[PDB]
Design a protein around this ligand. Structure first.
Ligand code: PWS
Ligand code: PWS
Ligand code: CL
Ligand code: MG
Ligand code: MG
Ligand code: MG
Ligand code: MG
Lengths: 194, 194
């Protein structure tokens, strides 16, 4: 029975805006919320994609391909799934394969594509598709993969065995100042709990 | 190689602020980033999210989730039980408290993540992911009494761990909900561990 009554702009940047949201609570009382949104969403089913890249090689354990980047909002290096915003007119699947090749150099194959999932729904309206992609690491195209970083993109590739992912993330967190992304950590936890 | 030079306040609300981050890019070039932060961090992290494993003998193991209207999203979301850590509260104690308030369940800590980032391209927000087991056969968890704070309105949805991804896909298909990216990520890995 809850719904939005109004969205009032508080502050609009080039990339991010702050809104005062007025909504109806389930007792029938109007309340407000401070809401973050991006300015970059057009007709896309979501802001962005994140790629779960499963690197497959004969006589290797499967790896999960991760990226390490400086994230200004965090003031530090973060370990994440490869990810980027969806270009206007682009499918989530094309954005996923394109961002994976740009950030890691790998040419993947689509396996599955999530519905739009919320990044931090108490804070923002931001959504992604989580796109699972396999990388045939036996293909010559995926032998010596070179990232194609865009202007101001600076990405390090970290491939960790699926069968030990959580302990290998713990060992990287123990060795330096860096944050693991919550989606990566949730995925590594589930691999342990299965 | 990369670091924060300065931060410029653009807009402060009660709960969230918008900053302009100046940072040194690895080439020796200074760059700007629009960054969101909470105003509420004093703590290991802003928040906890609880992975609650409901264990009842002769039943499938369930993951306990919550459905809430999220004003930034303009709709209903399915999430791990979660809230901000009170000043002076440990992440573990915040986890058991949030789980009790949102679900009525009384659980035991299994493990606690380090601080992990929610959306590091947009925000500095971090959480501890806290794995909790719930002895569902215990009297105290027979008729679980959820204690919602002012303006909290939370539905409990328990889904079998062994079919979690298909069950979440079903809810999105029929109920027009948004699944949280950490919940979806956990559900994917449970399928991918095979
Ligand atoms: C933790 S309560 C709250 N948090 C936020 C935000 F997440 F954006 F920081 C905005 C808001 O309006 N409230 C009531
Ligand atoms: C996707 S590029 C970008 N995104 C953001 C934000 F994520 F906050 F929306 C801010 C910013 O300055 N840039 C360059
Ligand atoms: Cl467990
Ligand atoms: Mg990216
Ligand atoms: Mg990119
Ligand atoms: Mg909550
Ligand atoms: Mg709460």
């Amino acid at each position: 029975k809850q719904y939005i009554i109004s969205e009032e702009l508080i502050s609009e940047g080039k990339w991010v805006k702050l809104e005062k949201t007025t909504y109806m609570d389930p007792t029938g009382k109007t309340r407000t919320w401070e809401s973050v949104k991006r300015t970059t969403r057009k007709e896309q089913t979501a802001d962005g994609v994140a790629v779960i890249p499963v690197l497959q090689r004969t006589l290797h354990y499967e790896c999960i391909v991760l990226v390490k980047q400086f994230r200004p909002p965090m003031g530090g290096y973060c370990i994440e799934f490869p990810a980027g915003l969806i270009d206007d007119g682009e499918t989530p699947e094309a954005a996923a394969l394109r961002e994976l090749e740009e950030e890691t150099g790998y040419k993947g194959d689509i396996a599955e594509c999530s519905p739009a999932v919320c990044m931090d729904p108490g804070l923002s309206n931001c959504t992604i598709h989580i796109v699972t992609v396999t990388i045939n690491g036996d293909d010559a195209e995926n032998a010596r993969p070179k990232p194609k970083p865009g202007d101001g993109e600076f990405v390090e590739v970290i491939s960790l065995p699926k069968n030990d992912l959580l302990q290998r993330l713990d060992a990287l967190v123990a060795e330096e100042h860096l944050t693991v992304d919550a989606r990566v950590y949730s995925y590594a936890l589930a691999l342990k709990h299965a």
